[PDB]
């Protein structure tokens, strides 16, 4: 009811994101998310993964 | 610090005699016979003995050799 | 007859007010139901069990 | 009072029992703690020399399960009071309505894991405001009469006394009203003088060392155990015919 | 980076009696929310304040008993004196007396006005005066200090064994109640990166708002000294 | 008398010591579990949310 | 009134890319203050010299494939955004690229200047080139802060701070009388251009000279 809820909200895909379709590395998404101008939904975007 | 003793489960075939080995090591570490090679960061003597077992420098056979060479030197 | 008493006293009809954060100060998501309910205090507490 | 009410809490509060009900009342002449007098009415009156209905309020008394009973006065000087209503508010019975809970700000948030599986989160404002603060009146009753030895006097200037207890007792017996209790202190003291026993001379040398009273009594004063600490309220020990000296009773 | 844009205090308003709209017109890209989030939490967390610590009442022993000639219990009177707001400038511990007998309510200006005691509220409610006999003599002690300290900490590390009559009050100072702030667009003809921020402070006539914001800036400047001037251990 | 020396000794002992926790109805074998204590203000223990 | 200054260890980690500073002990409710101050003082507004614009010769349209590259025409953009080359004297400079043969593009082959200083030759711009020669491209760098998603045509996001991740952890302290206190542990990662403790010092100077307009009168002793 808390951890499953949080990991369900932060990993749920949805359209019409702020700043859609950015190419970016792994840890830099936390750099972009913490300040401004990025939602957690962020559907259909290809980024770097190791 | 000394969360799981899984490395001694992998090395030593049994884990129930591991408790007797660890107690036999820890009493010799807290009374005397060998200086502690692990520094006392935030731990006691039994945790240092368990960490020395986790590193893989002591088992039942090494403590049997140590007991026989302590009984021989007397 | 509860939404009209909500919107009479300069409150939204949804009863949901956007809250900020106390630890990070950032804006939250979609607005949160806040209010003032009737709460109690039981007999059992720590000074008679510890 | 309950903002989210039912409507039947008025009939519950007027019939709760611990209240100040109104019988042929009127203008209240004087409002005080455990003191309220009512001017006699001219329309509805008794022929028995105009008797005055005065209600003695039971304030700061012990209830069951360590609860303080208080009577908060609600009426003032110079206002007419009809029949049926309440005059003084009891415990959690404010303004004549049953209000045994309070109203604080509720935000429905899972916040920082401090509310796991339907918990409750309390900030520092509730602690600083001292809301939901109750008073536990613990009874420490003792017996000092009718043993198999003889009659007894209250504490008889008991030995094994501490320095805080010597600062607590004014003359003898029960401590002064309003003293502090911390840890193990002598609150209730008693003796037990024997008539025909062995006087135990082995502790007699202890009588030469420590103790104001003779140590042959071997008394056990009811001290306060661990977990209880606070302030006393009143002394209402005993009433019987042929009243003795009774320095504190 | 030549950061020369510094915030200055300007045109602090006052609407009814308590909250003062302190405005900061020079801001930066994203430092407004940062400065507000730091300033509100530092101001509400730690700031010096003075209030009632204990009261010695002549004519009574403990706090659970009652007093004749009033319409209010002694414990409720201590809880109402807990919310009493007053400021002091000379010293820290000030003992104040209060003596008036009659018929009617009493005020906060009833006590003796001294050079260190500046009473700001005229309409504070204490226990009333019912009829012809109420000998109220309270020795109210106001102590300058810091955030919320309970009575058990005051008893701890203090061996005095006080006489019966000295009633301890929980140190609920509460100098600032609420702080509301937001970010608004700044003056035109700039680089289109300036903002401005307004801060309302419920300082209730005790501590000046400019003194409060300079104290908050002083604490935030002094708590950052494990930084650049660094040493090796 | 709560001098600072016994507070330091209490901090030294509590930092590295196993402490068992269990329930008064214990119908499982998982009820008795050891953990490590931390000095926390108040007089109520907390239970770990994965327990 | 009175406060406390901590005297313990400050920096004990690997000085290449890891950073774990410790701040014990503090006051109740102040690890979040320093954390939220340093995060928004070092993350959003911090000067740098990263790559702003990349102009490759050929197709001036979307995703630019089949113009001298084989595996991806977009991974080289991420490799240039990952590269940070500091500029000391000038403000904006444009670098070129020269590569011959089949293999990964060596960062040491880029023609540098007196102010152009590469941080590491091991940065690979492009990996798979199935051609005997390569096509040069203009790489313009700037000194602008404010890492924003770029919407300016004629293209990649100009990075402001050399760090990549910032987080903080609050831990209780073991002071004698005060128990519930703050032990601030700042876990922040740096790509490897400038050492992280000097970046923390730069954020400290931002917080220091940001507040010099309020500590004028009276003087802070």
Curated annotation (Swiss-Prot), chain C:
Modified residues (N6-acetyllysine): 7
Superkingdom classification of source: Bacteria
Record's comment on post-translational modification: Acetylated on several lysine residues in the presence of glucose.
Application of this enzyme or protein: Co-administration of salinamide and rifampicin or salinamide and myxopyronin suppresses the emergence of resistance to both antibiotics.
Described purpose of this protein according to its UniProt entry: DNA-dependent RNA polymerase (RNAP) catalyzes the transcription of DNA into RNA using the four ribonucleoside triphosphates as substrates.
Stated family: Belongs to the RNA polymerase beta chain family.
Subunit-structure text: The RNAP catalytic core consists of 2 alpha, 1 beta, 1 beta' and 1 omega subunit. When a sigma factor is associated with the core the holoenzyme is formed, which can initiate transcription. The rRNA transcription and antitermination complex (rrnTAC) consists of RNAP, NusA, NusB, NusE (rpsJ), NusG, SubB, ribosomal protein S4, DNA and precursor rRNA; S4 is more flexible than other subunits. In pull-down experiments interacts with CedA.
Record protein name field: DNA-directed RNA polymerase subunit beta
Organism: Escherichia coli (strain K12)
Residues of the full protein shown: 1194 to 1243 of 1342
UniProtKB/Swiss-Prot annotation, chain D:
Biotechnology: Co-administration of salinamide and rifampicin or salinamide and myxopyronin suppresses the emergence of resistance to both antibiotics.
PTM text: Acetylated on several lysine residues in the presence of glucose.
Effect the entry attributes to changing residue 117 to K: Disrupts the enzyme's active center
Top-level division of the source organism's lineage: Bacteria
Function of the protein: DNA-dependent RNA polymerase (RNAP) catalyzes the transcription of DNA into RNA using the four ribonucleoside triphosphates as substrates.
SUBUNIT field: The RNAP catalytic core consists of 2 alpha, 1 beta, 1 beta' and 1 omega subunit. When a sigma factor is associated with the core the holoenzyme is formed, which can initiate transcription. The rRNA transcription and antitermination complex (rrnTAC) consists of RNAP, NusA, NusB, NusE (rpsJ), NusG, SubB, ribosomal protein S4, DNA and precursor rRNA; S4 is more flexible than other subunits. In pull-down experiments interacts with CedA. (Microbial infection) Interacts (via flap domain) with Escherichia phage lambda antitermination protein Q; this interaction renders bacterial RNAP resistant to transcription pausing and allows it to read through termination signals.
Entry's family note: Belongs to the RNA polymerase beta chain family.
Name assigned to this protein: DNA-directed RNA polymerase subunit beta
Curated annotation (Swiss-Prot), chain F:
Coiled-coil region: none
Applied uses, from the record: Co-administration of salinamide and rifampicin or salinamide and myxopyronin suppresses the emergence of resistance to both antibiotics.
PTM: Acetylated on several lysine residues in the presence of glucose.
Family assignment from sequence similarity: Belongs to the RNA polymerase beta' chain family.
Function of the protein: DNA-dependent RNA polymerase (RNAP) catalyzes the transcription of DNA into RNA using the four ribonucleoside triphosphates as substrates. Resistance to the antibiotics salinamide A, salinamide B, rifampicin, streptolydigin, CBR703, myxopyronin, and lipiarmycin can result from mutations in this protein.
Subunit structure, as described in the record: The RNAP catalytic core consists of 2 alpha, 1 beta, 1 beta' and 1 omega subunit. When a sigma factor is associated with the core the holoenzyme is formed, which can initiate transcription. The rRNA transcription and antitermination complex (rrnTAC) consists of RNAP, NusA, NusB, NusE (rpsJ), NusG, SubB, ribosomal protein S4, DNA and precursor rRNA; S4 is more flexible than other subunits.
Protein name, entry field: DNA-directed RNA polymerase subunit beta'
Lineage: Bacteria, Pseudomonadati, Pseudomonadota, Gammaproteobacteria, Enterobacterales
UniProtKB/Swiss-Prot annotation, chain G:
E.C. number(s) listed in UniProt: 2.7.7.6
UniProt keyword Ion transport, yes or no: no
Principal EC category: transferase
Keywords assigned: Acetylation, ADP-ribosylation, DNA-directed RNA polymerase, Nucleotidyltransferase, Transcription, Transferase
Gene Ontology cellular component annotations, sorted alphabetically: cytoplasm; cytosol; cytosolic DNA-directed RNA polymerase complex; membrane; transcription elongation factor complex
GO molecular function: DNA binding; DNA-directed RNA polymerase activity; protein dimerization activity
UniProt key word Iron-sulfur: no
Annotated stretches, region: Alpha N-terminal domain (alpha-NTD): 1-218
Domain of life: Bacteria
Enzymatic reactions: RNA(n) + a ribonucleoside 5'-triphosphate = RNA(n+1) + diphosphate
Modification comment: (Microbial infection) ADP-ribosylated on both alpha subunits by the phage T4 protein ModA. ADP-ribosylated on only one of the alpha subunits by the phage T4 protein Alt.
BP term (GO), one: DNA-templated transcription initiation
Domains as described in the record: The N-terminal domain is essential for RNAP assembly and basal transcription, whereas the C-terminal domain is involved in interaction with transcriptional regulators (such as CRP) and with upstream promoter elements.
Protein purpose: DNA-dependent RNA polymerase (RNAP) catalyzes the transcription of DNA into RNA using the four ribonucleoside triphosphates as substrates. This subunit plays an important role in subunit assembly since its dimerization is the first step in the sequential assembly of subunits to form the holoenzyme.
Family: Belongs to the RNA polymerase alpha chain family.
Full protein name: DNA-directed RNA polymerase subunit alpha
Gene giving rise to this polypeptide: rpoA
Parent-protein start and end of this portion: 6 to 238 of 329
């Amino acid at each position: 009811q808390d951890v499953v809820l949080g990991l369900y909200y932060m990993t749920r895909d949805c359209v019409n994101a702020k700043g859609e379709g950015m190419v970016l590395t792994g840890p830099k998404e936390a750099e972009r998310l913490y300040r401004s101008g990025l939602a957690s939904l962020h559907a259909r975007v290809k980024v770097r993964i190791t | 610090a000394r969360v799981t003793v899984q490395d001694a489960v992998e090395k030593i075939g049994n884990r129930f005699d591991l408790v007797l080995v660890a107690a036999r090591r820890a009493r010799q570490m807290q009374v005397g016979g060998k200086d502690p090679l692990v520094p006392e960061e935030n731990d006691k003597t039994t945790v240092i003995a368990l960490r020395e077992i986790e590193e893989g420098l002591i088992n039942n056979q090494i403590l049997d050799v140590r007991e026989r060479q302590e009984q021989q030197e007397q | 007859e509860i939404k009209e008493l909500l919107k009479l006293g300069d409150l939204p009809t949804s009863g949901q007010i956007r809250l900020y954060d106390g630890r990070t100060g950032e804006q939250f998501e979609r607005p949160v139901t806040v209010g003032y309910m009737y709460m109690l205090k039981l007999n059992h507490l720590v000074d008679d069990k510890m | 009072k309950p903002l989210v009410g039912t409507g039947m809490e008025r009939a519950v509060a007027v019939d709760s029992g611990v209240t100040a009900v109104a019988k042929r009342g009127g203008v209240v002449q004087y409002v005080d703690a455990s003191r309220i007098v009512i001017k006699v009415n001219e329309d509805e009156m008794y022929p028995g020399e105009a008797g005055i209905d005065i209600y003695n309020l039971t304030k700061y008394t012990r209830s069951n399960q360590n609860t303080c009973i208080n009577q908060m006065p609600c009426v003032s000087l110079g206002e007419p009071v009809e029949r049926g209503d309440v005059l003084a508010d009891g415990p959690s019975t404010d303004l004549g309505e049953l209000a045994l809970g309070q109203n604080m700000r509720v935000a429905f948030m899972p916040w920082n894991g401090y509310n796991f599986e339907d918990s409750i989160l309390v900030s520092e404002r509730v602690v600083q405001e001292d809301r939901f603060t109750t008073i536990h009146i613990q009874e420490l009753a003792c017996v000092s009469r009718d043993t198999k030895l003889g009659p007894e006097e209250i504490t008889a200037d008991i030995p094994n006394v501490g320095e805080a207890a010597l600062s607590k007792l004014d003359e003898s017996g029960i401590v002064y009203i309003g003293a502090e209790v911390t840890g193990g202190d002598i609150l209730v003291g008693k003796v037990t003088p024997k008539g025909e026993t062995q006087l135990t001379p082995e502790e007699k040398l202890l009588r030469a060392i420590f103790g104001e009273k003779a140590s042959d009594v071997k008394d056990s004063s009811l001290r306060v155990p661990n977990g209880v600490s606070g302030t006393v309220i009143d002394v209402q020990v005993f009433t019987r015919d042929g009243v003795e000296k009774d320095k504190r009773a | 980076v030549t950061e020369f844009l510094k915030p200055r205090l300007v045109d602090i308003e006052q609407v009814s009696s308590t909250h003062a709209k302190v405005t900061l017109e020079p801001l930066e890209r994203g430092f407004g929310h940062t400065l507000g989030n730091a300033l509100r939490r530092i101001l509400l967390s730690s700031m010096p304040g003075c209030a009632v610590t204990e009261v010695e009442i002549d004519g009574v022993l403990h706090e659970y008993s009652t007093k004749e000639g009033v319409q209010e219990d002694i414990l409720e009177i201590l809880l109402n004196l807990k919310g009493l707001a007053v400021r002091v400038q000379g010293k820290d511990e000030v003992i104040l007396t209060l003596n008036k007998s009659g018929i009617g309510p009493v005020t906060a200006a009833d006590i003796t006005h001294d050079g260190d005691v500046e009473i700001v509220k005229p309409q504070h409610v204490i226990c009333h005066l019912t009829d012809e006999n109420a000998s109220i003599s309270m020795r109210i002690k106001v102590q300058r200090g810091r955030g919320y300290v309970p009575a058990s900490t005051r008893i701890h590390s203090e061996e005095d064994e006080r006489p019966i009559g000295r009633l301890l009050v929980d140190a609920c100072y509460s100098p600032v109640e609420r702080i509301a702030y937001n970010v608004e667009a700044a003056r035109v003809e700039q680089r289109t990166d300036l903002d401005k921020l307004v801060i309302e402070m419920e300082t209730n006539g005790t501590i000046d708002p400019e003194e409060a914001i300079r104290r908050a800036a002083t604490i935030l400047a002094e708590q950052l000294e494990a930084f650049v001037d660094l040493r090796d251990v | 008398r709560e001098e600072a020396v016994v507070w330091d000794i209490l901090d030294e002992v509590i930092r590295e010591h196993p402490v068992l926790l269990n329930r008064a109805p214990t119908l499982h074998r998982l009820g008795i579990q050891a953990f490590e204590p931390v000095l926390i203000e108040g007089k109520a223990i907390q239970l770990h949310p994965l327990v």
